[PDB]
Write a protein that binds this ligand. Structure first.
Ligand SMILES: OC[C@H]1O[C@@H]2O[C@H]3[C@H](O)[C@@H](O)[C@@H](O[C@H]4[C@H](O)[C@@H](O)[C@@H](O[C@H]5[C@H](O)[C@@H](O)[C@@H](O[C@H]6[C@H](O)[C@@H](O)[C@@H](O[C@H]7[C@H](O)[C@@H](O)[C@@H](O[C@H]1[C@H](O)[C@H]2O)O[C@@H]7CO)O[C@@H]6CO)O[C@@H]5CO)O[C@@H]4CO)O[C@@H]3CO
Length: 491
């Protein structure tokens, strides 16, 4: 017993591009001042993208870890821990983007002659942010499969960073699984014109995923079934489409077959690469983590359109998040849910948005499957009402004065370190959010004091067959949330 058993750690994402496209850590001195500000405020650690496109730029297995070694060196000197993201995706690239980091140019050159390695919508547009799950086991990248590329990157990371791993700097390894490092399809690409609150588009039209679907429907006894031709366009509203309207194609046997195939592609993608990540970090004192997106728009209508096009097959009578938490339990991994601050009342009504009940459904699913749940805010916020919503989600039933809370999140990573955060009046409110996350205790350098000790990563438990995974689609009632935190930052 102790209020310290109530402590939930706070981490801060580092600036995008802190080491740049040229693999140079540009300004150790500037980062250093900022990192020391963060250490004085009581922040437990930081999070950084380890961009595949910077490190394996020159060619297959041509890795240069030097600028990231210097960055981890400086973080360790500032007394902070680190969450490392194995970022196999593109950063930025659209209008007025601050940073643009693509994937390896050598992979991009293969895609010049085989455009089907990228995610593709019905119109034939290639999204180059991430390699389609269709080429995961295709040996077409100079003799390697895309999962062997990801596996090798993680093994080289473990060998060349083993002194930071052995010294306990790195708290967890987040492994990037899609666009923006999240396990999902690129269904809402800003770059292709999408604008909130639109339903997005299915991204299964590359030749590998289409050839896969057609063989599957032929085996289910319906060889004549096709991919959606009536789901509309990025910016539609669902009732405007044949697929998502009342009694439309999604409710059909053909539509339910497609939606089960499409969302299952992500579960097996997630499970095979995390199989690799557990081999690469076996024995290290690190926890594995993945990022799931919070797609709250259209959550309040029956068709949950934006979630379905993203690959999350979540309906009111079908839980599409607790199969992901179940799959994560054999790898002993954490579910990092990337949206934690929004309130429904902040949403335009015509978006039919349910941020607060999407969170209660995803975190209750994880704690029910007995995994650890972490999260991030989705958009930069500096105000107390955002911060008080993060703290309510961090500990849904308040502080337990008498022991550990029944329910608590494993960590929260705040989106971005910026000069704005550090502005004097903003930083004084961030300091109080850190205090309340810590349940009013000072920062605690030793995690074991607050029951966060990290053990050497055990080997993955056995494969869970997809029929036992999909049993977790049975809808359950969420655990109860307090209406408001008992540890307010105070407006
Ligand atoms: O590069 C863009 C953006 O990318 C990443 O954000 C994700 C986000 O994490 C996802 O959840 C999703 O976001 C949805 C929201 O969930 C949804 O509510 C809606 O958001 C509206 C906001 O609610 C509304 O306030 C307003 O947003 C403002 C915003 O408050 C401003 O701060 C400013 O936003 C910029 C950010 O400040 C900047 O960091 C960057 O954001 C990244 C983000 O860091 C990253 O996590 O760019 C944005 C855009 O300029 O301006 C906006 C208004 O322009 O309006 C939005 C709707 O326009 O919609 C978003 C998606 O639009 O998806 C994003 C994108 O992948």
């Amino acid at each position: 017993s102790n209020m310290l058993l109530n402590y939930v750690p706070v981490y801060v994402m580092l600036p995008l591009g802190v080491v740049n496209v040229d693999n140079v850590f540009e300004d150790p001195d500037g980062l250093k001042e900022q990192l020391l500000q963060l250490r004085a405020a009581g922040v437990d650690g930081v999070m950084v993208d380890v961009w595949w496109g910077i490190i394996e730029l020159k060619g297959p297995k041509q890795y240069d870890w030097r600028a990231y070694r210097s960055l981890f060196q400086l973080v360790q000197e500032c007394g902070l821990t680190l969450q490392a993201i194995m970022s196999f995706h593109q950063c930025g690239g659209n209008v007025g983007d601050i940073v643009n980091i693509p994937i390896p140019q050598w992979v991009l050159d293969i895609g010049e002659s085989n455009h089907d390695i990228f995610y593709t919508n019905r119109s034939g547009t290639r999204n180059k942010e991430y390699l389609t799950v269709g080429v995961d086991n295709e040996p077409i990248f100079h003799g390697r499969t895309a999962i062997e590329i990801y596996s090798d990157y993680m093994k080289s990371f473990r060998e060349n960073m083993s002194d930071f791993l052995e010294s306990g700097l790195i708290i967890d390894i987040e492994v990037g699984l899609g666009p923006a490092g999240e396990l999902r399809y690129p269904s809402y690409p800003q770059s292709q014109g999408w604008e909130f609150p639109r339903i997005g588009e299915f991204q299964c039209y590359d030749k590998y995923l289409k050839a896969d679907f057609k063989a599957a429907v032929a085996r289910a006894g319906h060889p004549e079934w096709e991919l959606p031709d009536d789901a509309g366009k990025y910016n539609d509203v669902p009732e405007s489409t044949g697929f998502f309207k009342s009694n439309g194609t999604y409710v059909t046997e053909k539509g339910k077959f497609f939606l089960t195939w499409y969302s299952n592609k992500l579960l097996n993608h997630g499970d095979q690469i995390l199989d690799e990540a557990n081999k690469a970090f076996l024995g290290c004192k690190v926890k594995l983590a993945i990022k799931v997106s919070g797609i709250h728009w259209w959550y309040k209508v029956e068709n949950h359109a934006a979630e379905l096009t993203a690959g999350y097959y979540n309906l009111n009578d079908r839980d599409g998040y607790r199969p992901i938490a179940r799959m994560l339990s054999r790898h002993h991994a954490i579910l990092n849910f990337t949206c934690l601050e929004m309130r429904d009342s902040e949403q335009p009504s015509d978006a039919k948005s349910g941020p607060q009940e999407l969170v209660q459904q995803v975190l209750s699913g994880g704690w029910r499957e007995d995994i650890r749940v972490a999260g991030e805010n989705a958009l930069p916020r500096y105000d107390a009402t955002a911060y008080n919503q993060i703290i309510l989600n961090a500990k849904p039933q308040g502080v337990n004065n008498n022991g550990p809370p029944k329910l608590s999140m494993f960590g929260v990573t705040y989106l971005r370190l910026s000069d704005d955060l550090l502005q004097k009046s903003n930083f004084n409110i961030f300091k109080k959010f850190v205090l309340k996350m810590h349940a009013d205790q000072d920062y605690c350098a030793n995690p074991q004091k607050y029951n966060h000790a990290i053990t050497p990563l055990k080997p993955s438990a056995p494969k869970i067959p997809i029929e036992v995974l999909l049993e977790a689609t049975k809808p359950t009632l969420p655990f109860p949330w307090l209406p408001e935190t008992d540890m307010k930052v105070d407006g």
